[PDB]
Amino acid sequence: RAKAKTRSSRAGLQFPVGRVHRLLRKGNYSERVGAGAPVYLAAVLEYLTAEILELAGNAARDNKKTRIIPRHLQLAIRNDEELNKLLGRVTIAQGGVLPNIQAVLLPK
Amino acid sequence: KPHRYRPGTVALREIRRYQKSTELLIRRQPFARVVREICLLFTRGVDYRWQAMALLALQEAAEAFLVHLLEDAYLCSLHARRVTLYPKDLQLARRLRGLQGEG
Amino acid sequence: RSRKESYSIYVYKVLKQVHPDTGISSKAMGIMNSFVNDIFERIAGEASRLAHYNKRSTITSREIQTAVRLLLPGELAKHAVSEGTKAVTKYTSS
Amino acid sequence: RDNIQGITKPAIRRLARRGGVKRISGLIYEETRGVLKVFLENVIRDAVTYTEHAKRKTVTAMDVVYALKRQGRTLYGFG
């Protein structure tokens, strides 16, 4: 027949492509979904998930643990303007708040 | 012996004259120049034509947003037991809107 | 019980790509399972709106590009373009 | 020469005197131009993206409503 080569490996992409194409057909976002759109969209989600998880790891090692709990995700989403402006209308489950004391509450 | 009003009481006639009318308050020429400036800041030099209704749309929505900003900041300044306005109060009414003013 | 598909394996694989030595809790997998569906639904909703303005009856790889430069704020979004371009050429040359 | 001072020293006073303002400081006339320019940036940065997407070189009034909707404020009367 032919070789069993996944469509993700024709991009080197760690997110599936057939899943995105099935979701764009069946989820009713258009009549026809062109073949380039899931190739593009799997890369965009790969980039965004890596952008979260890298700062998540930098928050993780700065508390000397290994598993990431949602507190590192809250402290690494809301600490950079290039992502905080994307997720201003999202609360995180058990995220906590940034360490935030105002200006003139401190003594002296 | 001329006539000089109380300072302040021209503003109430100005407010009740301007809240009635549906005219615009920014002239079309300087707003047109300050909006045609930004396309050269975003589109890498090439000029885009502005269809002459869409300029009225920006001219409408800019005032309909900015007057909300100024009115809400004045409400904040009235809360501060002072009757005038300040850059601190425009700062405060810009901050307590989250990302809703910015998307 | 039957079949509830998710993005559990793929975030694990991209974590092992980025980090060799970081585990990840199940609640973190829940967060990165809702985040992916949320971002994908926003970008595909913008793709459908851009299909519906310009009267074309499809969502091509060109029409994703306007949505990705639309949503993501500035200096992030450009990188996504230099991912996806660097993605899509690698599809079409192969 | 200068392009930002078209929004002139009584025009901002005219806007405030629309929005129920009795007396303004002398610093708002410079400071609110920042907010007006930030808002105009966040509208035109989507408007030219839309009308660049349709491979046109004008900016149609539909592609100002279709950007103001993405901002969060739909603008009626321009359908």
Partner: peptide
Amino acid sequence: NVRRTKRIRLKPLEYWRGE
């Protein structure tokens, strides 16, 4: 290991006054 994507990891970059 090829990640740590090329961005500018920056500040809070507070709004409401400019910047």
